[PDB]
Subunit: 237 residues, 4 copies
């Protein structure tokens, strides 16, 4: 029973399991069936940027995805995350391919967590930033088909020598250190995440997508969670 909170860049509409009929960004609370979605125009071969924002005061998880184009999709969801997540978590990126496929290439990833207590001027904080991924990235936990180093990029799902994506692939990268996501005595608990991605496909349809996620610290890829399950959920319920 892993616990997952995620923001999904979902490139392939699985209408049989509640996806909207178009590519979309979604906020997933413990389920692949997003609590909230917004229409997303995925630009093939373009570098996209995703921003994830949350604070325990406003209690609103917000995401926005944009392209140099200026086009962007935004989704927000009201939720008290310390009611959902355990006190300590790991943070990661996940992606899959299914019958259809795409590259799930991460060019950068940054994260910041802060816990500001009632004790005057006392903050715990964690911040990391990857603008380059080397072949042996020791501060990343790689699961499934994820690899690092290729062009200083992070490839979440399987890519061939020529740079062609493979189907039925799943990969995740988690930051090595546990993250203290909330604390009972913190007046403000907040976090921000940003990553840049390149999704390209020669298919009639790209699949299946990329997600930023927060999980219990021992989280691993659920069995058979390629394709529509985005490497996050054990079932589609």
């Amino acid at each position: 029973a892993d616990t997952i909170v995620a923001v999904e860049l979902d490139t392939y509409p699985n209408t049989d399991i509640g996806d909207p009929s178009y590519p979309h960004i979604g906020i997933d609370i413990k389920s692949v069936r997003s609590k909230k979605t917004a229409k997303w125009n995925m630009q093939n071969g373009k570098v996209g940027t995703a921003h994830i924002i949350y604070n325990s005061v406003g209690k609103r998880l917000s995401a926005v995805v944009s392209y140099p184009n200026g086009d962007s999709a935004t989704v927000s969801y009201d939720v008290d995350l310390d009611n959902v997540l355990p006190e300590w978590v790991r943070v990661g990126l996940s992606a899959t391919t299914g019958l259809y496929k795409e590259t799930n290439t991460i060019l950068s990833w940054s994260f910041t967590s802060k816990l500001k207590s009632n004790s005057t001027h006392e903050t715990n904080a964690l911040h990391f930033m990857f603008n380059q991924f080397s072949k042996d990235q020791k501060d990343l936990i790689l699961q499934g088909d994820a690899t690092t180093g290729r062009d200083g990029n992070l490839e979440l799902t399987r890519v061939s020598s020529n740079g062609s994506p493979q189907g039925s692939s799943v990969g995740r990268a988690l930051f090595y250190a546990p993250v203290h996501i909330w604390e009972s005595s913190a007046v403000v608990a907040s976090f921000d995440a940003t990553f840049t991605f390149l999704i390209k496909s020669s298919d009639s349809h790209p699949a299946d997508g990329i997600a930023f996620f927060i999980s219990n610290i021992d989280s691993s890829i659920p069995s058979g969670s390629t394709g529509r399950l985005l490497g996050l959920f054990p079932d589609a319920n």
Copy 2:
């Protein structure tokens, strides 16, 4: 006239202008009559901390004030600030006394602003932090009775040689540089503010309060804005 967005720590109930009948924190949008308030237990002689948070994605302005004993008050309000504030602003702190009085001592003040544009990896950012103020604080514009240096603090309103606060006082401190609070090509426009404060009084009722505010770059203390107007507004409409 000035355009003001503010978070007020209001120590004195002026019920005839919409104040609730108790000390309170409020979010002010272009008026002294808060769009949203919350009951605040002001702790005389104790050091309090205010946190203000906003991002352009969730479009929710939040503030929490707390003391070391864990007592706190929180208020949130949904608003798109790019429809309220001009593109360039100055940020500041303001405080007043009236018939009744209190010290309006600031012990620290920090602010962070970020404009993340659609251009990949293109962020503009401003951040400052004061944990002490000196007698000649050149990066602060002091207006009214505000002074710096007294015990490394910032005294917003007038205080006598022995520490006794004066009545009918108003003072403000604004950060020297203009701040680019929003932009059209910005996918994210967030800001955070924090300050710590010491409000003490020997009156039966302390007055009138402290506020963090955001105004047009040429903002000045409106005529007659002492006491209940918190040095921010020309009138109580």
Copy 3:
């Protein structure tokens, strides 16, 4: 008479004023005749990056300029800057051309200053970052030929309509707010600066260079400081 400390990216050797006979980077303390230089291979048309570092403990002003190549040049100079600079300063970038010319385009600029006092914790900080420059950049003070907005860049020296640089040009940009660069009570005072630049020329000899500098707050371009004087110094003493 201004007080100037600067790191020069000197593209044109003026041997009659103490320059080495090759393009170079140098540390200038109150004089255009560098206290220290190192040979620098400027790459026409490439985006370069300059990093400037200093702290009041090691007391070594250090600079490094690099290209994606990545060839790079480094220069360091042992000096106590709080013996040179005034307590409050402004920071800026400057560039010139003379009989020979080049573009002096700034693509980004960030700066961080910190004063850490003896009082446990208690830090004063200032940080800004520009990754794009709009036509009306209110938090910059532009001097001479300097303009902002052209492709979201900062052009320090004159550029014709077609993108060709003009000769005998001088321009500077300074951050709007005064910076508290040293303080007597501070145990650690440090600053860090970064900028990316694009110098391109069609001349047989590109000239004259770019500099990051720290000066007295009311610093302006000295008369006749184009070309070899880099807009920083009134003469070559």
Copy 4:
């Protein structure tokens, strides 16, 4: 055999292994016999602060230790750390007692590291800050006697229920995630570290001290490294 770089706050002069005949701060490169020391007027039972700065461009490691009254000791040493440390390291704090003893209490600890490659605008960074340590601090690896939670502090060496230090104790805390401290392509590989500590003793002479250190990721407490070896070294060579 571990590789150690360290800044020691040495409270007990072990003159037989090269210690100066007074409490001192030192920079240790692979040896308990400091490459550089400075006299340190240690203040029993007072809260002190250590700042550590590595300037990778200047190749200069510096440390300053101070108390609220302003008294400070400083030490600098020239070294290029990519010649000493492996590419990946862990960072941590260490402390010991021997025949003589002292509390080795850590009240706060922050660390910031930055690898800036030659690829334009590509910076990897890690930052963490602890202003309080909980009883279950999942992002720290505790070794030997080190414990967390007591008054929100980190106790590196054994302390009794009534706050009295024990002799012949050794304990270390390492940040969980491996740190990429240098890389071939990196033009800048600097870091800063800060911690606040409380050393108290009823002994005539407190011993043995506290160190901030950097080591190979699999570093553990060397056999019989209590007392003068500060839990860092296997012997006094």
